[PDB]
Design a protein around this motif. Structure first.
Motif, PDB file in Angstrom:
ATOM      1  N   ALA A  30       2.103  15.618  -7.343  1.00  0.00           N
ATOM      2  CA  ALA A  30       1.289  14.412  -7.385  1.00  0.00           C
ATOM      3  C   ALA A  30      -0.112  14.663  -6.839  1.00  0.00           C
ATOM      4  N   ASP A  31      -0.959  13.645  -7.018  1.00  0.00           N
ATOM      5  CA  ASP A  31      -2.314  13.572  -6.483  1.00  0.00           C
ATOM      6  C   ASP A  31      -3.159  14.781  -6.858  1.00  0.00           C
ATOM      7  N   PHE A  32      -3.862  14.675  -7.985  1.00  0.00           N
ATOM      8  CA  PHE A  32      -4.812  15.680  -8.435  1.00  0.00           C
ATOM      9  C   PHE A  32      -6.246  15.316  -8.065  1.00  0.00           C
ATOM     10  N   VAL A  49      -7.652   3.098  -2.899  1.00  0.00           N
ATOM     11  CA  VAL A  49      -6.371   2.695  -2.333  1.00  0.00           C
ATOM     12  C   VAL A  49      -5.313   2.861  -3.414  1.00  0.00           C
ATOM     13  N   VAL A  50      -4.087   3.156  -2.991  1.00  0.00           N
ATOM     14  CA  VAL A  50      -2.954   3.313  -3.897  1.00  0.00           C
ATOM     15  C   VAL A  50      -1.950   2.215  -3.581  1.00  0.00           C
ATOM     16  N   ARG A  51      -1.608   1.419  -4.589  1.00  0.00           N
ATOM     17  CA  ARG A  51      -0.692   0.302  -4.422  1.00  0.00           C
ATOM     18  C   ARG A  51       0.404   0.379  -5.471  1.00  0.00           C
ATOM     19  N   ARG A  69     -13.201  13.206 -13.573  1.00  0.00           N
ATOM     20  CA  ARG A  69     -12.534  14.501 -13.625  1.00  0.00           C
ATOM     21  C   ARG A  69     -11.049  14.364 -13.304  1.00  0.00           C
ATOM     22  N   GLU A  70     -10.701  13.526 -12.323  1.00  0.00           N
ATOM     23  CA  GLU A  70      -9.289  13.299 -12.031  1.00  0.00           C
ATOM     24  C   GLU A  70      -8.592  12.631 -13.211  1.00  0.00           C
ATOM     25  N   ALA A  71      -9.229  11.620 -13.806  1.00  0.00           N
ATOM     26  CA  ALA A  71      -8.635  10.961 -14.964  1.00  0.00           C
ATOM     27  C   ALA A  71      -8.430  11.945 -16.106  1.00  0.00           C
ATOM     28  N   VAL A 110      -3.380   4.514 -13.258  1.00  0.00           N
ATOM     29  CA  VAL A 110      -2.017   3.993 -13.259  1.00  0.00           C
ATOM     30  C   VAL A 110      -1.064   5.121 -13.631  1.00  0.00           C
ATOM     31  N   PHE A 111      -0.134   5.433 -12.729  1.00  0.00           N
ATOM     32  CA  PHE A 111       0.855   6.479 -12.937  1.00  0.00           C
ATOM     33  C   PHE A 111       2.257   5.881 -12.933  1.00  0.00           C
ATOM     34  N   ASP A 112       3.139   6.459 -13.748  1.00  0.00           N
ATOM     35  CA  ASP A 112       4.556   6.136 -13.658  1.00  0.00           C
ATOM     36  C   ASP A 112       5.023   6.275 -12.215  1.00  0.00           C
ATOM     37  N   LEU A 113       5.694   5.244 -11.713  1.00  0.00           N
ATOM     38  CA  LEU A 113       6.127   5.240 -10.323  1.00  0.00           C
ATOM     39  C   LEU A 113       7.354   6.128 -10.150  1.00  0.00           C
ATOM     40  N   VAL A 114       7.325   6.971  -9.121  1.00  0.00           N
ATOM     41  CA  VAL A 114       8.475   7.762  -8.703  1.00  0.00           C
ATOM     42  C   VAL A 114       8.997   7.151  -7.410  1.00  0.00           C
ATOM     43  N   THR A 115      10.319   7.010  -7.317  1.00  0.00           N
ATOM     44  CA  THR A 115      10.944   6.229  -6.261  1.00  0.00           C
ATOM     45  C   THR A 115      11.808   7.050  -5.314  1.00  0.00           C
ATOM     46  N   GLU A 118       0.835  -1.191   0.000  1.00  0.00           N
ATOM     47  CA  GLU A 118       0.000   0.000   0.000  1.00  0.00           C
ATOM     48  C   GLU A 118       0.875   1.247   0.000  1.00  0.00           C
ATOM     49  N   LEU A 119       0.559   2.190  -0.890  1.00  0.00           N
ATOM     50  CA  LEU A 119       1.221   3.486  -0.925  1.00  0.00           C
ATOM     51  C   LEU A 119       0.341   4.613  -0.406  1.00  0.00           C
ATOM     52  N   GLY A 120      -0.918   4.333  -0.101  1.00  0.00           N
ATOM     53  CA  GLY A 120      -1.830   5.358   0.367  1.00  0.00           C
ATOM     54  C   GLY A 120      -3.198   4.751   0.575  1.00  0.00           C
TER      55      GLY A 120
END
Ligand SMILES: CN(C)C(=O)c1cc2cnc(Nc3ccc(N4CCNCC4)cn3)nc2n1C1CCCC1
Length: 291
Positions: free
Chosen positions: A146-148, A17-19, A50-52, A79-84, A9-11
């Protein structure tokens, strides 16, 4: 969806949920927001598309990239490109050298993403450290907005009451007064963030949320000694112009990118190490992790 493997889980959200996930056949890593579309309101259903639509429009090196939008039976994936690189604020506290120039470098990148949002008629409305990431662990990783999920679409410079949304510490005065608002609210948040980047603690803060809002509406911030005695006058000037109560005279993102502390950074911003700022940020990050 079956093309992706899901991991930690990322959020977490009300209905989402964000994974971390990975594209199975190619091994490319992403950050997927998983929304249970079942038993979803019409209000919540429009917010999701609207977010999409907003994320699909934004292609900028300082904004997260939308890779795919997927509609399945009872679930929807963003699905977003992952930032690490983690959070910008957690990276700063890990540094041995940190000065105004670095803060100016960071705010410049944040201002590019905000300016690119506003040039496309998009107001983020929730600028805060949690939404300011770093592209990689590489030395010169780019800042990524991030997160719009709370972002709104606006026509030109037409204000309106778009609702009470955001995070208390970064809310603008006009949102608190329930006035019509728009792009300037993002610039008030950037002012708060810039203040924190320089000294490591917020300009507005109170145990009681009601006192906090009176502080914000009154612009009751200052530059106390001794920590601000070593901050350049141009840095305080840029903060002042972001934390301007009147939204029409508040500096815009395109104007702030042309402020001497930003565009003439190498000769205006101080290079002195600000260890007390690093120390305060460590506490500031610790307090955030509780809530
Ligand atoms: C999904 N949506 C709508 C987005 O805008 C979005 C696009 C994203 C692209 N890459 C990441 N990577 C990432 C971010 C946070 C952390 N954590 C490190 C340890 N503690 C704190 C956080 C770890 N990895 N996150 C993204 N996000 C969201 C940003 C907030 C969470 C997910």
């Amino acid at each position: 969806t079956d093309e992706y493997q899901l991991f930690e889980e990322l959020g977490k959200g009300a209905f989402s949920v964000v994974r971390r996930c990975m594209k199975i056949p190619t091994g490319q890593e992403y950050a997927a927001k998983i929304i249970n579309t079942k038993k979803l309101s019409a209000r919540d259903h429009q917010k999701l598309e609207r977010e999409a639509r907003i994320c699909r429009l934004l292609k900028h090196p300082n904004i997260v990239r939308l890779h795919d939008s997927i509609s399945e039976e009872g679930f929807h994936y963003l699905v977003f490109d992952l930032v690490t690189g983690g959070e910008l604020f957690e990276d700063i506290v890990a540094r041995e050298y940190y000065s105004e120039a670095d803060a100016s470098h960071c705010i410049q990148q944040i201002l590019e993403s905000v300016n690119h949002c506003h040039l496309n008629g998009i107001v983020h409305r929730d600028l805060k450290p949690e939404n300011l990431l770093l592209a990689s662990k590489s030395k010169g990783a780019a800042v990524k907005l991030a997160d719009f999920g709370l972002a709104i679409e606006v026509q030109g410079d037409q204000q309106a009451w778009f609702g009470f949304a955001g995070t208390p510490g970064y809310l603008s005065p006009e949102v608190l007064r329930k006035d019509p608002y728009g792009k300037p609210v993002d610039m008030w948040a950037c002012g708060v963030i810039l203040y924190i980047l320089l000294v490591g603690y917020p300009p507005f803060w109170d145990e009681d949320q009601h006192r906090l809002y009176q502080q914000i509406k009154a612009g009751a911030y200052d530059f106390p000694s001794p920590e601000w005695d070593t901050v350049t006058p141009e840095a305080k000037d840029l903060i002042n112009k972001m934390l301007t109560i009147n939204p029409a005279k508040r500096i815009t993102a395109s104007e702030a990118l042309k402020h001497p502390w930003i565009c003439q950074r190498s000769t205006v911003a101080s290079m002195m190490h600000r260890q007390e700022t690093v120390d305060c940020l460590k506490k500031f990050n610790a307090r955030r992790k509780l809530k």
